[PDB]
Each structure stands twice: as structure tokens, then as C-alpha cells.
Amino acid sequence: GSHMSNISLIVGLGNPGSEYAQTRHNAGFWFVEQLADKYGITLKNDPKFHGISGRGNIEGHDVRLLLPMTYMNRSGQSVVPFSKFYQIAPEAILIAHDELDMNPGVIRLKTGGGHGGHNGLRDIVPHIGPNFHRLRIGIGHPGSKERVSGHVLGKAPSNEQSLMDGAIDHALSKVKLLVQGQVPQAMNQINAYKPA
Ligand SMILES: [Cl-]
Ligand SMILES: [Cl-]
Ligand SMILES: [Cl-]
Ligand code: NA
Ligand code: NA
């Protein structure tokens, strides 16, 4: 199964289909797809777990990657059985997701806490509890509570996209720390990122 706080499972949250692929709510998919390319991990169809998944070596560690194919608000229907079957404890899971409470170009690593309104996390925390790690990829504030769907299901303007892309790139360079269990150092180095 998993082994302490070495990260062994990296999940990216998002919605399936070309119409959602460029939307802010797919920030987690962006991160995990780029990480998979970086390390040569194949992401293949995983019908048993309602997702796309892979497994491979990251810096000498066996790591699994998962993109739920359930739609965002049903993400737990992939993450939970996957983690149960492979016996991966929450403490060894990193979930990458868009974060409305942070600016584009801000990125943070958090351990624990609630969903913060995120409809994918809301489908996961009830089942595995809160003690997994999160890569919170800022996507900017939506304005009103009424603009929140239109914000997360929007394609960001190019300046915001550039800021997100640079933050994601920075985080990719710190995955080595995470798979090695160096969560405190990773937190310090991720959270210190500035775009400019
Ligand atoms: Cl959604
Ligand atoms: Cl945080
Ligand atoms: Cl979070
Ligand atoms: Na976008
Ligand atoms: Na550390």
C-alpha cells in the first residue's frame, strides 16, 4: 500500500470532455497531465475506477496518478474505490485542484482542512476524511456567489492563464520533494512562489 507521508497517489480534479478541458475547474487535470508527461507515466483508460490512471517511477518512488472521469461533483466515485483497492492512506494522497480563494499565479500545498466550497473535494472528504494533501492552484476570485459557475467553467484570459501555467510549472519541479516525504520543505518552497 502506501508508506507514511511519501506521496504515492496524485489525483487531478476536473471534468471530462473537450468542452471542459481549458476551463479553470480543470486546473488539477492540467497539473497531473503535465506531471505524467514529465516523468513518462502513461495515463490510460481505467474503467474499473471511472477514471484515467497511470503508474510509474517518479524519482525512485512508485507513484499512481488518477484523473476521475465522473464529472467533478462525483469525483469521490473514482478516488475512494481507487484508494481503497490499492490500500493508499489519505496521508499519502495529493489532490491537485483549482482554488477560488487564491489569485492566478498563487499556488499552495495544504494538509487537511475542508473543501472550501469546491464541489469535487466535497465528494471526497466525507469518505476518506480531510487528512490528504492538496495542491491549491489559484484561479482567482469569481466576484459574486452568483458568478461562481461561470467563473470555474470559464476559460481564463491569457494573462491569467500564463500566471497559472507558471505556478503549475513551479509545482512540477517540487514533486520530487513530495514523493520523498519532504512535505514541510515542499510546502515552504511551493508556497513561496511568486509569478514576477
Ligand atoms: Cl463542475
Ligand atoms: Cl494553504
Ligand atoms: Cl484544499
Ligand atoms: Na482557463
Ligand atoms: Na521536509
Domains of the chain, by residue range, sit at: 1-196
Q: Which residues are known catalytic residues?
A: 25
Helix H or strand E encompassing 9:
strand 9-12
Do residues 62 and 47 make contact, with C-beta atoms less than 8 angstroms apart? no
**Ligand 3 centroid to residue 99 C-alpha, Å:** 7
**Experimental technique used to determine this entry:** X-ray
- Bridge partners of 57, per DSSP, are 62
Q: What is the DSSP string of 23-56?
A: SGGGHHHHHHHHHHHHHT---EEEGGGTEEEEEE
Task: Give the Å distance between the CA of 176 and the centre of ligand 5.
Answer: 11
Phi, psi of 109 (to 5 degrees): -105, 125
Q: Is 39 annotated as a binding residue?
A: no
Q: How far is the CA of 30 from the centre of ligand 1 (A)?
A: 16
Does 45 show up as a binding residue in the annotation? no
59 Cα: distance to centroid of ligand 2 (angstroms): 25
Q: For residue 154, which ligand has an atom nearest its CA?
A: 4
Q: What is the domain class of 1-196 according to CATH?
A: alpha beta
Give Cα 82 to chain centroid, integer Å.
Answer: 15
Does 73 count as an annotated binding residue?
A: yes
Q: Resolution limit in angstroms?
A: 1.0
